[PDB]
Amino acid sequence: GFKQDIATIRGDLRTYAQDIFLAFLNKYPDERRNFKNYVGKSDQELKSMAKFGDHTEKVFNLMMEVADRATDCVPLASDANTLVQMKQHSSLTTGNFEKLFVALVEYMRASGQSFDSQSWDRFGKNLVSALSSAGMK
């Protein structure tokens, strides 16, 4: 289920983080334009850039912390607060996050593995509503 998926992802975090983030950028090319340094790079070129690996891993680490602190795929209000308040996130709307979760769920469904896709979809929806409640546009 959702809790095991957290353990699966954490076990090979940089690999999942990279593959899911690439899926996101490839499914929504306009989102790439928010990442100036990733414009004009293939998947394999990105996977050779230090900040790409680092940043995707740090993003997914925080995702997994929020996922683990959630109850029944409902994240803590305080965690939503953090994601809204981050300087790095002042440009964002909730649509950016919805898109990331759509790509994430589609990745999980396509994979050979027994991810609880439905729970991640619901976690995504609940996080987007929590971000809105914490004041994201």
Ligand X SMILES: Oc1c(Cl)cc(Cl)cc1Cl
Give the residue ranges of the annotated binding site for heme b: 36, 38, 51, 55, 58, 88-89, 97
DSSP state letter for 42: -
Q: Which does 58 bind (CB under 5 to 8 A by kind): ligand HEM, ligand X, none?
A: ligand HEM
Chosen from ligand HEM, ligand X, none, partner binding at 27 (C-beta under 5 to 8 Å by type): none
Interface with ligand X, residue 92, by CB under 6 A: no
The alpha helices in the chain, defined as continuous H runs, are 2-11, 13-27, 29-32, 43-46, 50-69, 77-85, 94-110, 117-133
Question: Binding residue for ligand X (CB under 6 A) from 10, 14, 27, 55?
Answer: 55
- Give the Cα separation of 58 and 13 in Å (integer): 9
Per CB under 6 A, 79 contacts ligand HEM? no
CA separation for the pair 125, 30 (Å, rounded):
21
* Residue 51 binds to ligand X (criterion: CB under 6 A): yes
16 touches, from ligand HEM, ligand X, none (C-beta below 5 to 8 Å by class): none
SS3 label, residue 36: helix
Residue 56 interaction partner, one of ligand HEM, ligand X, none, beta carbon < 5-8 Å per kind: ligand X
- Please pick, from the candidates 14, 27, 41, 55, the single residue that binds ligand HEM as defined by CB under 6 A: 55
If phi > 0 it is left, if psi is from -120 to 50 it is alpha, else beta; for residue 126 that is alpha
Q: Give residues in contact with ligand HEM (CB under 6 A).
A: 31, 34, 55, 58-59, 62-63, 83, 88-89, 92, 96-97, 100
